[PDB]
Every structure is written in structure tokens, then in C-alpha cells.
């Protein structure tokens, strides 16, 4: 369990809902890349990885196909034991120290996501935001649950309230985590 | 350039 | 990534040692394979290598050693059998690439050993309806090699479940006036 | 195992044919190759998983469809003489660098002219009298002359059962100058002298021919070379 | 409310002392329950929960499946680590250190740095390491950068200068930021 560097080559995910799937590689808790299974392309998270590293997207499509085949057999073996919804933990914090004028990024850490089906959206003064919103894939955890991170590139003003709307089956109402400078 | 290695999952018994 | 085979056709006698040369282009972690293709049949994997010990043991009593410095994966057998007479292909692969590059293929012919060789020409009785007359030679050792027909309207054929050990070749012509007597034949012959 | 239908096929320049392939190994990846002398194996199309298709190195003049996890077919819209090759279907668990399991193979010959297709003559040879007196073993050299293409598979049938013991057939089967020249194949059946001397024993040299179908057009005076078996029988003689 | 059946496969590599120690653990998970796994130290497939015995016994019986998984220590773990040295293990991001007074509390904001290895200390005037500082755990930004906020229970005087000493492998000399 104890090691200098922990890596995952990779995190193979498939679920009955959709049916949707995910394939990504991780190193020391950070995502290297994710394979866009529909577009059949490898999307690297760093500019350094895009220039010096490559991955065959065919490996992901074949692995998810094995996962699709394996899931159906284990459902019958478990006697249709469905996944129980978990209460997620939402935390909102800035990337750099907040200073009016300097460009900053708002991070919305959504921990303990199970099953991996979540809607993370941003709200500024009650209005939905889509501009400058980036989202990472489902990052694996040791307890076999997931965590997703959402970003919001903004400029802190004199009066501008921000909220992170998280929609999950583990919650009856969408959880809102407020943030203000 | 050399491609990245990947873990192949073992197929479950269909019988 | 590519693979090269310097030999195209190898002729060897039964029981003798075998060595099929095969060398690969490049690879950080290469996947080297060996396939056998019998006439009228598909390709069957003999042995493989990707990790572990350099010397890998495969099916049908075959073995191969992986030379990284020489970038080769030569297939070897201490004693060859008559059943091994087939086309041999060596494939190459990489860990981070879902692709396989097959070689041109090396043809192998194994001449069966005859303990009691009795080479003799036999005058065969052809059918009434057929215009052609037939003659054949049976039981000749690996030292004797039958050559292609000299005359154009004369045709020769070569060659040849544990009965019998001996093999035969047929030489016939539509002329009907064809005589059995030949390129490099054994001095001791009957009839 | 990998099953491939048909085994042999003769087509005209412009005709359409589908090569059906099936595997019962629960493999995700399925392949379609073509074997040519000197070139080796050249991949046409390959299906990595069900509902996924990708081009090989020679995909021109071919189209594929992955029906399910076990079946994968190779369709030819218009036949060309350049497509004259033996096609092999392969399958691996998930990746191309896994153990590939191949089928029996489908020999294909595309011709511009359908006039140069001839069924062979089953000239069953009667064992020589001098052979029984010397080596004490009878030999039946069933010869085939004047056949095109090499779409011929020989089988020896003795007393209603197909025999393999004593069968000696040529690996590859007259005019060296002619491009559409007919070849000749020889097949020998070596049996004991006591077995041939018995008159109750039956010998049959069966030749399976793969020619034209019933739907194919024929406007020649000579007999149509249809998918019919050519067989000749021979009975045992004491003297 | 909607019914969902989740399946997970995690092919993990554990590296210690570079290439010296390497361990692979392929985890087969149904929903959140890990039923089957393959440990490189074990050498064979083993069942974790009563849902694992049919899978583990079938994968151990197949010679090609066992030979492939045993070889994965070199074909994927050792192979990708060599590729990791050229990019990820060579990646060094210098942190941005700033002090903000929140006026009887000082927060040392160490922003955007890679790798995780960091040592932050609060000093009172000159060579007096304070023992009354509360540091936040290593915060993961997710975009290959980390941040750590070190708070200090401070009492200011007439001639008091508060310095924050930050040590990171990307720097040849530590970062010292003062506050008057
Ligand atoms: C595996 O799951 C079963 C759940 O039901 C179905 O089965 C699987 C395979 C999928 O198809 C599912 O989608 C599907 O829902 C378990 O079966 C039930 O277990 C319950 C345990 O508390 C048990 O109460 C229940 O019985 C109820 O029905 C009884 C009457 O049965 C009627 O239905 C049958 C259907 O075939 C029909 O012929 C008649 O109309 C008949 O009267 C009733 O008397 C009782 O009081 C309950 O209300 C189980 N139902 C069925 C259909 O089996 C299964 O549980 C185990 O097996 C059963 C046979 C029993 O021994 C239980 O005690 C066991 O726990 C479960 N198996 C395991 C190993 O966990
Ligand atoms: C996410 O939003 C869609 C509508 O765009 C909705 O159908 C779905 O149920 C939402 N998911 C969750 C987990 O709330």
C-alpha cells in the first residue's frame, strides 16, 4: 500500500446508465489523459504530454467492450445488486489568492461521487454561467468511489457572489456551495 | 514516438 | 515498425537441426511471434515473447532466443520432423501500439528419412479411355533429388496415417510411347 | 475455432460475393487478411470490438459489417482480377498482439473470361500386376488432367468411409507459356496386396469441384461446370 | 432514484526507489465492491469477496491469461515509468508565495507547485521557529498543481518582522517572504 509513486494505467469505467463509459490514466493522483470514446481520440491534460507522449485510442474501446461483457455476468452473479447512492462532499476555493483586478480561477471539488453520474454547473448572482467553465473527468479513489473538479475563470469584482450547483442522486435537492471575496 | 502501455482486463467466464 | 526474413526457401533432411532467421526493426518493449502455416491450412502460433526469460519454449517442440543487441528472434529445433514441412512467418508488435506486422514468410521442405531404401522403376498399366501412359519410382533416400521434365509434352510430378514410411513420384506422358528411362538416378534399379 | 464460408469461389469481373466468418472463442477483435506469394499477410479490414470498423492496409474494393460479437463478414461489391487471392479470417481476445486464431481459408479466383473453366477427368488407375509380385503392396494413382482453376480437393473413399492412411497427394498442381494454362494433380493410394485381392472391397477417388452456381449465365455449347462432385469407382481383383 | 450498475477495472503500478521496487495490482470492482484482484507479489488471481471465486478460478486455469498478467510488470508498469521520467518526473513548477493578514493572524499562501514535496515554516523576527502554526493539508488543484495555506496565531509588536520560509525541489534556494 506504501509507495513513492502510485500510477494507474488505467482507470476503466463502465455503467448501465446511458450506457456510458470512461477510460483515463493517472499518476500520483493527477489525470494524464482521457480517451474520448465517441470521437475515438486521446485528450492529454498537459501541453508537455501532447508534444512528447501518444496513446492508441483503440486500446480503450476494446477494454470498455470487455468491461461491458464482464458487467452483465457479475450482475447475474450478484443477483441484480444495484449501486447505492452516496452523499457527495462539495468544497469551493480559489486557485490563487483573491485580488480585485488579477485573473483568478474558482475550483469546485466534488468528493465521494457514487455512482459516477453528476451535473456540476456554476452560478453568478443567481444566473447560470457557461463561459470560461472547464471540467475534469471522474478521478478514481482508493474506496473505489470518484471525485470530479470543475473550474471557473473569472475576474473578482467589488460585488459578485458565486455558487457551485451540484446535482447527484445521493441528494434530494441540488447542493449549492457559496463563495464570495 | 513510443506509445503508452495499457492494462488488458481479463474476460469473465460466459458459461 | 517492420520485420525482415533473409531466407525464402530452406531444404533440410529429417532429424537434422533447424534455424530460421528473423530480425526486427525497433521496439521499446517488443512483441515477437512465430506462426506456422501448413498447405491448405491457416496460421498457428508456435511461440511468443514480450517479457521474462529470453529463451521461450513453444508447441510442436520448438524453441527461440530473443537477442536485443542483435535485434533478432531466431527459431530453432534440435530434430526436425516431416510434419514441420510448412511456411513460417514471424510477426512484430509494440505495447503502446495496436498493430501487427507479418513477415514475407520462409518456405520449409523436410525430406522424410527411409531406413530401407529400394529405388525401382515400375511399368504401370494405364486405362483404356485415357490416351496417356504412366510409370513411377518408389523409395529413394534424401541424397537423390528428382529434376523437372526435359521434354515439353512429358510431365513429371513430386511428391509425398502411419502406413507406409516410403514415398513415390509419378512421370507420365500423353504420347503413350513413353519409356521410364532420367536426371541423376541411383545406379541400383529394378525392372 | 474460426469458421469461414465458402472454401473456394470462382467469380466474373463485376460479380458480387460475401465471405462469412464466425468464431466461438468469445473474442472481441476479428480480422480479414489476404495471402499472396512473396507479400505475405496484408490486412484488409479489422473489427476491434462489436459495432466498430477500421481500415487495414489494402481496404480498396472491399467493405465489412460486424453483425455481432461472433460474426464478421467481408463483402465485395465489384470483383477485379487483382483480388485473386486466398482470404484468411483471424480473431484475438482484445488486442492485435494477442494469440491470433485463423480459419481454414477461402481461395478466390477472379477471371475476365468464363470460357476457360474445365472440370477434371477422374482416371482411376488399376494397380500394376508387377507391383503385387514385387513390393507386395497395391497402389492406385488417381490422376486429374485439364482443370482450371486449382479449386479442387481430393478425397479417397474405401467401403463408404473416407480414408487418409496411404493417401499421397501433390502440394501444388501443361503449357508454361499460357497464362490461363490448365494444371495436373496426382494422388496415390497405397494399400496391402491382400486388401486389393479381395473383390468385395470398394475404391473411389472423389473429386469435389467448386464452379459456377445455378443463377450464373451460360451461353456455350459444352457442358456447364457447376458445383458437382466428379467421382470414379474401382473394384478389387484377385488375378 | 434511477437504477444503475457500475463496473470498474483499475490496473495500478506502485513504484519505490525508482525502478528497484515495482508492484502491480489489477482490481476488478463491481459497483464499490472489489471482488477479484491480481498482485505481482502473489503471482496468481485471488478472490476478495464471495463474488470473486468464479472469476479468479477461471482466470488462473487459463495459461494465456496468467502469462499475460504476470508479464504486465514489464510491458506496462516498467514501460510507462521510462516514459514518465522524460515528462512527469522531470516536471518542476515554482510556487508563488504571498502573505495576507486576516489583524492578529497571518496566512502564508503557497500557490501552484509540482511535485507534492513541500516544507513551509513560520519565523518570528530572526532564527525563532514558531510553535503555534496551523497548516492546511496538501490541496490538489487537479490541473497538475498543488497549494498549501499555513496560518499563524500572531501577536504584533513595534519592531516585529514575520518571515515565511518555503522549501521546494524546483528551487535551488528557499523562498523567504517578509511582512511588517
Ligand atoms: C435472488 O434474487 C431474488 C429476487 O427476485 C428475482 O430474481 C432475480 C433472479 C431477478 O430476476 C430479479 O429481477 C427478481 O426480482 C430472490 O428471491 C426472493 O427472495 C426474497 C427474500 O426475502 C423472498 O421473500 C421472495 O419470495 C417472495 O415470493 C413468495 C411467492 O413467490 C411467488 O412468485 C413466484 C415467482 O417464481 C411464482 O411462481 C408464484 O406466484 C409464487 O407464489 C412469497 O411466498 C414470499 O413470502 C415472498 O414474498 C423471493 N422471490 C423469488 C421469486 O424467489 C432470491 O432469494 C432467495 O431465493 C428464494 C427462492 C428464497 O429461498 C429466498 O429466501 C432466498 O433469499 C435471491 N437469491 C439469493 C441467493 O440471494
Ligand atoms: C443532469 O441534467 C440532465 C438534464 O440536462 C438531467 O436529465 C439529469 O437527470 C441530471 N442528472 C442528475 C444526476 O441530476
From TrEMBL, chain A:
Membrane topology designation: Single-pass type I membrane protein
Subcellular location: Endosome membrane; Lysosome membrane
S-S pairs: 108-164
GO biological process: adaptive immune response; antigen processing and presentation of peptide or polysaccharide antigen via MHC class II
Record-level GO cellular component terms: endosome membrane; lysosomal membrane; MHC class II protein complex
Glycosylation sites: 79, 119
Keywords attached to this entry: Adaptive immunity, Disulfide bond, Endosome, Glycoprotein, Immunity, Lysosome, Membrane, MHC II, Signal, Transmembrane, Transmembrane helix
Main localization (coarse): membrane
Domain named Ig-like: residues: 88-168
Family: Belongs to the MHC class II family.
Name of this chain's protein: MHC class II HLA-DQ-alpha chain
Part of the intact protein present: 3 to 183 of 227
UniProtKB/TrEMBL annotation, chain E:
GO biological-process terms attached to the record: adaptive immune response; antigen processing and presentation of peptide or polysaccharide antigen via MHC class II
Regions annotated as coiled coil: none
Keyword Glycoprotein appears in the UniProt entry: yes
Domain Ig-like positions: 95-180
Family: Belongs to the MHC class II family.
Intracellular or extracellular location(s): Endosome membrane; Lysosome membrane
Glycosylated sites: 17
Major localization class: membrane
Name of the featured protein: MHC class II HLA-DQ-beta-1
Sorted UniProt keywords: Adaptive immunity, Disulfide bond, Endosome, Glycoprotein, Immunity, Lysosome, Membrane, MHC II, Signal, Transmembrane, Transmembrane helix
Membrane-topology descriptor: Single-pass type I membrane protein
GO CC term (a single one): endosome membrane
Disulfide bonding pattern of the chain: 13-77, 108-164
Domain of life: Eukaryota
Covered residues, full protein: 3 to 189 of 229
Amino acid at each position: 500500500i506504501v509507495a513513492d509513486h502510485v500510477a494507474s494505467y488505467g482507470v476503466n469505467l463502465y455503467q448501465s446508465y446511458g450506457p456510458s463509459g470512461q477510460y483515463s490514466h493517472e499518476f500520483d493522483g493527477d489525470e494524464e489523459f482521457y480517451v474520448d470514446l465517441e470521437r475515438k481520440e486521446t485528450v492529454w491534460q498537459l501541453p508537455l504530454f501532447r508534444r512528447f507522449r501518444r496513446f492508441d485510442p483503440q486500446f480503450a474501446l476494446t477494454n470498455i467492450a470487455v468491461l461491458k461483457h464482464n458487467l452483465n455476468i457479475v450482475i447475474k452473479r450478484s443477483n441484480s445488486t444495484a449501486a447505492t447512492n452516496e452523499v457527495p462532499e462539495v468544497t469551493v476555493f480559489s486557485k490563487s489568492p483573491v485580488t480585485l483586478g488579477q485573473p483568478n480561477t474558482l475550483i469546485c471539488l466534488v468528493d465521494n461521487i457514487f455512482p459516477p453520474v453528476v451535473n456540476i454547473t456554476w452560478l453568478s448572482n443567481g444566473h447560470s454561467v457557461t463561459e470560461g467553465v472547464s471540467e475534469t473527468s471522474f478521478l478514481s479513489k482508493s474506496d473505489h468511489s470518484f471525485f470530479k473538479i470543475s473550474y471557473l475563470t473569472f475576474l473578482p469584482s467589488a460585488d459578485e457572489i458565486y455558487d457551485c450547483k451540484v446535482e447527484h442522486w445521493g441528494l434530494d435537492e441540488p447542493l449549492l456551495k457559496h463563495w464570495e471575496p | 514516438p513510443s506509445g503508452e502501455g495499457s492494462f488488458q482486463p481479463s474476460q469473465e467466464n460466459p458459461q | 515498425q517492420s520485420v525482415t526474413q533473409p531466407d525464402i526457401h530452406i531444404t533440410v533432411s529429417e532429424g537434422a537441426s533447424l534455424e530460421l532467421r528473423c530480425n526486427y526493426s525497433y521496439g521499446a518493449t517488443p512483441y515477437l511471434f512465430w506462426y506456422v502455416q501448413s498447405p491448405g491450412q491457416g496460421l498457428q502460433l508456435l511461440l511468443k515473447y514480450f517479457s521474462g526469460d529470453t529463451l521461450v519454449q513453444g508447441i510442436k517442440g520448438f524453441e527461440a532466443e530473443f537477442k536485443r543487441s542483435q535485434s533478432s528472434f531466431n527459431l530453432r529445433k534440435p530434430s526436425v520432423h516431416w510434419s514441420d514441412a510448412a511456411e513460417y512467418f514471424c510477426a512484430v508488435g509494440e505495447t503502446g501500439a495496436n498493430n501487427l506486422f507479418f513477415g514475407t514468410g520462409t518456405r520449409l521442405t523436410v525430406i522424410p528419412y527411409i531406413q530401407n531404401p529400394d529405388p525401382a522403376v515400375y511399368q504401370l498399366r494405364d486405362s483404356k479411355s485415357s490416351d496417356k501412359s504412366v510409370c513411377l519410382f518408389t523409395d529413394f533416400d534424401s541424397q537423390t533429388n528428382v529434376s523437372q521434365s526435359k521434354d515439353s509434352d512429358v510431365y513429371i510430378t513430386d511428391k509425398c496415417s502411419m502406413d507406409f514410411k516410403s514415398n513415390s513420384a509419378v512421370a507420365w506422358s500423353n504420347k503413350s510411347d513413353f519409356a521410364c528411362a532420367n536426371n541423376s538416378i541411383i545406379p541400383e534399379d529394378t525392372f | 475455432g474460426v469458421t469461414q464460408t465458402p472454401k473456394f469461389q470462382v467469380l466474373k469481373t463485376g460479380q458480387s460475393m460475401t465471405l462469412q466468418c464466425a468464431q466461438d472463442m468469445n473474442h472481441n477483435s476479428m480480422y480479414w487478411y489476404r495471402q499472396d506469394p512473396g507479400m505475405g499477410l496484408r490486412l484488409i479490414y479489422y473489427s476491434a470490438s462489436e459495432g466498430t470498423t477500421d481500415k487495414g492496409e489494402v481496404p480498396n474494393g472491399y467493405n465489412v459489417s460486424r453483425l455481432n460479437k461472433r460474426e464478421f463478414s467481408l463483402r465485395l461489391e465489384s470483383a477485379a482480377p487483382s483480388q485473386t487471392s486466398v482470404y484468411f479470417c483471424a480473431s484475438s481476445e482484445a488486442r492485435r498482439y494477442n494469440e491470433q486464431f485463423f480459419g481454414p481459408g477461402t481461395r478466390l479466383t477472379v477471371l475476365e473470361d468464363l470460357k476457360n473453366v474445365f472440370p477434371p477427368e477422374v482416371a482411376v488407375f488399376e494397380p500394376s500386376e508387377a507391383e503385387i509380385s514385387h513390393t507386395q503392396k497395391a497402389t492406385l494413382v488417381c490422376l486429374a488432367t485439364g482443370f482450371y482453376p486449382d479449386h479442387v480437393e481430393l478425397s479417397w473413399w474405401v467401403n463408404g468411409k473416407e480414408v487418409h492412411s496411404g493417401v499421397c497427394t501433390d502440394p501444388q498442381p501443361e503449357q508454361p507459356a499460357l497464362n490461363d494454362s490448365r494444371y495436373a494433380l496426382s494422388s496415390r493410394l497405397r494399400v496391402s496386396a491382400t486388401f486389393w485381392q479381395n473383390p468385395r472391397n470398394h475404391f473411389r477417388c472423389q473429386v469435389q469441384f467448386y464452379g459456377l452456381s445455378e443463377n450464373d449465365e451460360w451461353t456455350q455449347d459444352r457442358a456447364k461446370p457447376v458445383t458437382q462432385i466428379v467421382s470414379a469407382e474401382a473394384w478389387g481383383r484377385a488375378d | 432514484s434511477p437504477e444503475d450498475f457500475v463496473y470498474q477495472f483499475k490496473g495500478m503500478c506502485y513504484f519505490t526507489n525508482g525502478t528497484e521496487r515495482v508492484r502491480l495490482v489489477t482490481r476488478y470492482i463491481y459497483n464499490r465492491e472489489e471482488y477479484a484482484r491480481f498482485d505481482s507479489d502473489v503471482g496468481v488471481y485471488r478472490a476478495v469477496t464471495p463474488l470473486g471465486p468464479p472469476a479468479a478460478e477461471y482466470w488462473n486455469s487459463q495459461k494465456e491469461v496468467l502469462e499475460r498478467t504476470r508479464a504486465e510488470l514489464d510491458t506496462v508498469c516498467r514501460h510507462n515509468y521510462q516514459l514518465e521520467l522524460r515528462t512527469t518526473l522531470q516536471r518542476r513548477v515554482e510556487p508563488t508565495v504571498t502573505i495576507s493578514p486576516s489583524h492578529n493572524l497571518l496566512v502564508c499562501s503557497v500557490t501552484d507547485f509540482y511535485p507534492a514535496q513541500i516544507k513551509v515554516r513560520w519565523f518570528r523576527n530572526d532564527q525563532e521557529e514558531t510553535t503555534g502554526v496551523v497548516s492546511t493539508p496538501l490541496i490538489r488543484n487537479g490541473d497538475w498543481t498543488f497549494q498549501i495555506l499555513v496560518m499563524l496565531e500572531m501577536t504584533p509588536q513595534r519592531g516585529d518582522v514575520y518571515t515565511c520560509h518555503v522549501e521546494h525541489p524546483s528551487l535551488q534556494n528557499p523562498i523567504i517572504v517578509e511582512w511588517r
